[PDB]
Scaffold this active site. Structure first.
Site, PDB file in Angstrom:
ATOM      1  N   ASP A 200       0.914  -1.085   0.023  1.00 35.08           N
ATOM      2  CA  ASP A 200       0.008   0.187  -0.006  1.00 35.08           C
ATOM      3  C   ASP A 200       0.823   1.243   0.003  1.00 35.08           C
ATOM      4  OD1 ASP A 200      -2.358   1.389  -0.214  1.00 35.08           O
ATOM      5  OD2 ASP A 200      -3.244   0.838   2.030  1.00 35.08           O
TER       6      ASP A 200
HETATM    7  C1  LIG Z   1      -2.767   9.414  -8.206  1.00 34.70           C
HETATM    8  C2  LIG Z   1      -3.986  10.017  -7.460  1.00 34.70           C
HETATM    9  C3  LIG Z   1      -5.012   8.903  -6.876  1.00 34.70           C
HETATM   10  O1  LIG Z   1      -4.317   8.092  -6.110  1.00 34.70           O
HETATM   11  C4  LIG Z   1      -3.946   6.721  -6.562  1.00 34.70           C
HETATM   12  O2  LIG Z   1      -3.989   6.313  -7.690  1.00 34.70           O
HETATM   13  C5  LIG Z   1      -3.281   6.081  -5.646  1.00 34.70           C
HETATM   14  C6  LIG Z   1      -1.878   5.678  -6.036  1.00 34.70           C
HETATM   15  C7  LIG Z   1      -4.047   4.675  -5.226  1.00 34.70           C
HETATM   16  O3  LIG Z   1      -3.126   3.557  -4.897  1.00 34.70           O
HETATM   17  C8  LIG Z   1      -3.094   2.670  -6.138  1.00 34.70           C
HETATM   18  C9  LIG Z   1      -1.707   1.981  -5.899  1.00 34.70           C
HETATM   19  C10 LIG Z   1      -2.043   1.035  -5.116  1.00 34.70           C
HETATM   20  C11 LIG Z   1      -0.925  -0.146  -5.030  1.00 34.70           C
HETATM   21  O4  LIG Z   1      -2.108   1.200  -3.565  1.00 34.70           O
HETATM   22  C12 LIG Z   1      -1.262   1.998  -3.007  1.00 34.70           C
HETATM   23  C13 LIG Z   1      -3.250  -0.074  -5.395  1.00 34.70           C
HETATM   24  O5  LIG Z   1      -3.499  -1.145  -4.489  1.00 34.70           O
HETATM   25  C14 LIG Z   1      -4.294   0.835  -5.244  1.00 34.70           C
HETATM   26  C15 LIG Z   1      -5.366   0.193  -5.824  1.00 34.70           C
HETATM   27  O6  LIG Z   1      -3.823   1.856  -6.419  1.00 34.70           O
HETATM   28  C16 LIG Z   1      -4.935   4.856  -3.839  1.00 34.70           C
HETATM   29  C17 LIG Z   1      -3.847   4.737  -2.912  1.00 34.70           C
HETATM   30  C18 LIG Z   1      -5.831   3.997  -3.610  1.00 34.70           C
HETATM   31  O7  LIG Z   1      -6.225   3.615  -2.279  1.00 34.70           O
HETATM   32  C19 LIG Z   1      -6.012   2.196  -2.129  1.00 34.70           C
HETATM   33  O8  LIG Z   1      -6.688   1.440  -2.915  1.00 34.70           O
HETATM   34  C20 LIG Z   1      -6.672   0.235  -2.262  1.00 34.70           C
HETATM   35  C21 LIG Z   1      -8.015  -0.406  -3.110  1.00 34.70           C
HETATM   36  C22 LIG Z   1      -6.851  -0.035  -0.761  1.00 34.70           C
HETATM   37  C23 LIG Z   1      -5.757   0.551  -0.294  1.00 34.70           C
HETATM   38  N1  LIG Z   1      -5.696   0.438   1.091  1.00 34.70           N
HETATM   39  C24 LIG Z   1      -6.677   1.000   2.048  1.00 34.70           C
HETATM   40  C25 LIG Z   1      -5.495  -1.028   1.508  1.00 34.70           C
HETATM   41  C26 LIG Z   1      -6.036   2.003  -0.714  1.00 34.70           C
HETATM   42  O9  LIG Z   1      -4.929   2.726  -0.286  1.00 34.70           O
HETATM   43  C27 LIG Z   1      -7.065   4.580  -4.431  1.00 34.70           C
HETATM   44  C28 LIG Z   1      -7.983   3.579  -4.574  1.00 34.70           C
HETATM   45  O10 LIG Z   1      -6.924   4.962  -5.606  1.00 34.70           O
HETATM   46  C29 LIG Z   1      -7.730   5.789  -3.542  1.00 34.70           C
HETATM   47  C30 LIG Z   1      -8.966   6.374  -3.974  1.00 34.70           C
HETATM   48  C31 LIG Z   1      -9.509   7.123  -2.862  1.00 34.70           C
HETATM   49  C32 LIG Z   1      -8.822   6.934  -5.148  1.00 34.70           C
HETATM   50  O11 LIG Z   1      -9.559   6.689  -6.107  1.00 34.70           O
HETATM   51  C33 LIG Z   1      -8.218   8.298  -5.330  1.00 34.70           C
HETATM   52  C34 LIG Z   1      -9.060   9.365  -5.417  1.00 34.70           C
HETATM   53  C35 LIG Z   1      -7.140   8.195  -6.162  1.00 34.70           C
HETATM   54  O12 LIG Z   1      -7.660   7.982  -7.429  1.00 34.70           O
HETATM   55  C36 LIG Z   1      -6.040   9.341  -6.384  1.00 34.70           C
HETATM   56  C37 LIG Z   1      -5.904   9.978  -5.236  1.00 34.70           C
HETATM   57  O13 LIG Z   1      -6.745  10.130  -6.921  1.00 34.70           O
END
Ligand SMILES: CC[C@H]1OC(=O)[C@H](C)[C@@H](O[C@H]2C[C@@](C)(OC)[C@@H](O)[C@H](C)O2)[C@H](C)[C@@H](O[C@@H]2O[C@H](C)C[C@H](N(C)C)[C@H]2O)[C@](C)(O)C[C@@H](C)C(=O)[C@H](C)[C@@H](O)[C@]1(C)O
Ligand SMILES: [Ca+2]
Length: 299
Positions: A200
């Site tokens: 994460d």
């Molecule tokens: C760029 C800007 C975007 O950020 C990301 O792309 C990052 C880089 C994600 O990590 C990326 C990368 C990665 C590896 O996680 C770090 C991956 O697992 C996820 C799905 O996407 C994040 C953090 C994800 O969270 C994670 O989602 C998981 C489903 C569970 C996890 N946790 C609670 C267990 C949680 O932190 C998740 C879904 O995007 C959060 C929601 C709120 C969003 O849709 C938000 C608005 C994002 O789109 C963002 C801010 O705009």
């Protein structure tokens, strides 16, 4: 709230943690626990988790095993050390620094502590060192690990299975599905090693100093031994190809596992982001995630 503050003080007191009442702060929390920041009577900042659910030990076993590995071996970064760990309270001394950014969950946006338009190169250098150290921790030397542990082929089959399961539940657009399958079927693009990952890694969990060095990582619930690529996705999504390349370069040059199609592979894993959103929708029941998943699945 006076009741809640009084309760925090009392629970901490029972674990011999003596808090300055005026410093107690309740943070955004989910259903598992209430997050609290407070300073003790020696001026040291703490992070507390007040449990909201039964069976704390089974539900935190994996996270704690991961933390035990990191605290045992890693020196280039800090991780939470749960000095207090009971069914009634988890608490650790707050890591140094601040998150590189925190998610504002209503516009769907990071509130950044770095300049997104001029990202400090030390962020990538330091995170590359941190990840290379993490991913080379000898998890195999533990006698009884309950983390998920994949060989490289098991990591590929895990993704294959996860994709099939999401398709069965929600459907997947044809072009997107074909892209995923081409990735799964491209032998040479897949890594030939796995390692202990954080799982994460994103700006909210990377603690940075005033120079944007990553000095610590929090929130280890997703730790497992698998494809290291997951820990690079944030850099790509937040910083684009430049930020992905900078992280890969730093990681490679300090000795991290590198293979010729690493960047390409990470970009395909990014294209599989909808799998994660769909899974989260299914397990959380949060409608907004169902909507986001269906949009991202191109159905
Ligand atoms: C760029 C800007 C975007 O950020 C990301 O792309 C990052 C880089 C994600 O990590 C990326 C990368 C990665 C590896 O996680 C770090 C991956 O697992 C996820 C799905 O996407 C994040 C953090 C994800 O969270 C994670 O989602 C998981 C489903 C569970 C996890 N946790 C609670 C267990 C949680 O932190 C998740 C879904 O995007 C959060 C929601 C709120 C969003 O849709 C938000 C608005 C994002 O789109 C963002 C801010 O705009
Ligand atoms: Ca610029």
């Amino acid at each position: 709230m006076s009741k809640d503050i009084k309760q925090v003080i009392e629970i901490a007191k029972k674990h011999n943690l003596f808090l300055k009442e005026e410093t107690i702060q309740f943070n955004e929390s989910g259903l598992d626990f209430q997050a609290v920041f407070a300073q003790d009577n020696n001026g040291i900042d703490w992070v507390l988790r007040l449990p909201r659910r039964e069976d704390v030990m089974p539900r935190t076993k994996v996270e704690k095993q991961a933390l035990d590995l990191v605290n045992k071996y890693a020196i280039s970064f800090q991780a939470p050390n749960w000095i207090i760990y009971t069914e009634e309270l988890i608490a650790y001394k707050k890591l140094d620094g601040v998150p590189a950014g925190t998610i504002d969950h209503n516009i769907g946006n990071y509130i950044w502590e770095i300049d997104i338009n001029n990202v400090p190169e030390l962020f990538h250098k330091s995170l590359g060192r941190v990840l290379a150290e993490l991913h080379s921790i000898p998890s195999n030397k533990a006698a009884a690990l309950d983390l998920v542990v994949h060989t490289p082929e098991e990591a590929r089959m895990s993704m294959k299975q996860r994709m099939d399961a999401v398709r069965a539940k929600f459907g997947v657009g044809e072009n997107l599905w074909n892209r995923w399958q081409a990735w799964l079927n491209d032998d040479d693009m897949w890594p030939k090693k796995t390692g202990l990952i954080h799982g994460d890694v994103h700006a909210g969990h990377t603690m940075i100093d005033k120079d944007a060095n990553v000095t610590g990582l929090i929130d280890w619930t997703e730790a497992k031994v698998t494809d290291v690529s997951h820990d690079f996705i944030f850099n790509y999504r937040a910083f684009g190809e430049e930020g992905l390349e900078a992280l890969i370069l730093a990681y490679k040059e300090i000795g991290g596992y590198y293979w010729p199609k690493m960047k390409e592979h990470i970009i395909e894993l990014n294209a599989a982001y909808p799998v994660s959103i769909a899974e989260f929708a299914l397990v959380s029941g949060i409608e907004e995630y169902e909507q986001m998943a269906k949009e991202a699945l191109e159905v």
